[PDB]
Amino acid sequence: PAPHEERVGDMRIVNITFSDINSIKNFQPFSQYFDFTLTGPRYNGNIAQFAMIWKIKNPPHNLLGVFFDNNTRDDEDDKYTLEELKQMGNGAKNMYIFWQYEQK
């Protein structure tokens, strides 16, 4: 056993896995950044309430969303894969990657 670490430069990549997306609703503060009215995992172009609106391109089936905890980045749907977004922290100290646990 050793620490797991995923990062890009100084940006920690924080993989968070939930069985149900709705549990993120109770996940402060990330509940405020998700937009649970949207279909398909989104990333945020900036810090704003419900900012995770930009469609990640070709997302893994169990990707729920990406939240960059600071700064801004280009904001376009269906352009940035998850991998590319790891390069798009743009000074975010943390890129939260929300995953859905795949059961059964």
Partner: protein, 193 residues
Amino acid sequence: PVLEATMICIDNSEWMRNGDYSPSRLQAQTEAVNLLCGAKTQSNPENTVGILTMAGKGVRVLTTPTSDLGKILACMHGLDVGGEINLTAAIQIAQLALKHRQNKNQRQRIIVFAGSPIKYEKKALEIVGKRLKKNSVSLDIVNFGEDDDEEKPQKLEALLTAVNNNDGSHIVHVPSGANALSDVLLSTPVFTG
């Protein structure tokens, strides 16, 4: 709420592979823990949360208490599983990690996720609990997992009674059911104070 350093003691024992909390106790705990980390850090920006695992090959501090939520949550990815919890070592090490990171006027809290059999005498636990009390450490116990340890809730209650100071300490007994571990806890003082 108040200023608090919290050491969350994660059950990563072999018992946590059980799917009676779906998809596993480990995962139900991880989600509760993650939510708790969010709640605690968002309750007060000077709150710190640390995480240790109690089983595996021995108690492992994943992070000493930090307000760095990213660092905390990153500790919940890639948990090892195995062994049995060393609850007394965990509480001892949690107290150490607490004392390591303690900032001025930070109350200290240990949260123990007791997802496995409690192989301790009641009196031994009470003594540990009384020591937590003397060191001004609050304790939250999350008791979950049906492993035919019939004495478990009462032993954990006795631990909680020993530690409890001004109702700062709490125990939640969470059955496996439709209500996920985390959704049960959300309504309890573990989250609400």
